[PDB]
Every structure is written in C-alpha cells, then in structure tokens.
Amino acid sequence: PVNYYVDTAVRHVLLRQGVLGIKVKIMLPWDPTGKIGPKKPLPDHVSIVEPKDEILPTTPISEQK
C-alpha cells in the first residue's frame, strides 16, 4: 500500500546568499479515500464488526409472516 500514500511538490524561496529549497511531502489519508484511497480494508488489521445482541432462547417463540 505504501506505493499510493505519497504526494510531493517542490518550490524555492530566495535569500541573497543562497536559496532555500522547499520540498513538501504529504501522506495520503486512507480514511478519506474519495475512491482514491483503497476501498479494501487495511491488510494487517482484520477489520472486525461489532456483534449483534439478541435474546437467548429459553422457551420457543414462533412468529408467522
């Protein structure tokens, strides 16, 4: 994934004795993918989901649809 989390721009600012050369790098946000960040979940992190609560059956309760 590290192939697609870098943005880079370059500029320079002027002193008389020398130039200050400014490279700007930014890491890309996975969370605001905007369809560019990978839709797929992060490889290492096993994206788990919150379990759902329900009543543990004690007496049979039957519904008709």
């Binding site: 797929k40 992190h45 096993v46 989901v49």
Partner: protein, 132 residues
C-alpha cells in the same frame, strides 16, 4: 522460522474474545468462518489466522489456557468450581492440639469441647536450620 506475528496472534485473540461463538474447529471451515466474522484482506493472512485459531481451539479442548479467559470460560469454570464433597474436610471427630493452644482455648473457656486431643510437643527444640 514459524513464529506468529503479533498481528495474527492479536487477530486470534479478538476473534476468540469477540466472535468465538461462531467459529468452527475445521481449518478448511475455519478460514470461511474467519471471512464470515471479520474481513481478512488477503489469503495467506486468513490461513495464518485459521491455523492459529485451530491451535487455540485444540488447546482449549486439551484443557486450560494460562493467558486466555473469556466469559464463556468464566461460566464453565464456575460450573466446574462448585465441587462440594459430601463430608466437610473440617468436620472431624478428633483433631490434634498442643498443650499451649489448649491453654489458649481455655483462656476463652472453650476447653470443654471433646474433639480436642492432646499431642505432646517434640522431644527438643530442633527447629532451626544450621548457620553457615
């Protein structure tokens, strides 16, 4: 060189502590239950997790796990914790008591109890380890 990374170990921990009720024992079903309960974004990873989880379930079917204790294990332990013998280990007919603790009991006037039996002290005071 088959030491499990903390990522797969932690995945097994969170799976068996959060979604244990849905997992099965078979590896070949285990990666399927893994992909049902959570999302593994790779294949090698899901076999990693499935293999370790089979290891944990084999370990629990063997017996206790030193570092792992879940609510289900808590209730099964409290089921296994309630072992009550028919006869109390404390209620006995004759118990030995030194003369000094007989004096201690008599100071409270409970020396009249019949279950106490005198045991004479040891011959000498040979109770210290040699110095050196």
């Amino acid at each position: 060189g088959r030491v499990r990374t903390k990522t797969v170990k932690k995945a097994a921990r969170v799976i068996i502590e959060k979604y244990y009720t849905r997992l099965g024992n078979d590896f070949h079903t285990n990666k399927r239950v893994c992909e049902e309960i959570a999302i593994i974004p790779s294949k090698k990873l899901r076999n990693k997790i499935a293999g370790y989880v089979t290891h944990l379930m084999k370990r629990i079917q063997r017996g206790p796990v030193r570092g792992i204790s879940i609510k289900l294990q808590e209730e099964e332990r409290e089921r296994r914790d309630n072992y009550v013998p028919e006869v109390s280990a404390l209620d006995q007919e004759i118990i030995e008591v030194d003369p000094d603790t007989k004096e201690m009991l008599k100071l409270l006037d409970f020396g009249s109890l019949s279950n106490l039996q005198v045991t004479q002290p040891t011959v000498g005071m040979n109770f210290k380890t040699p110095r050196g």
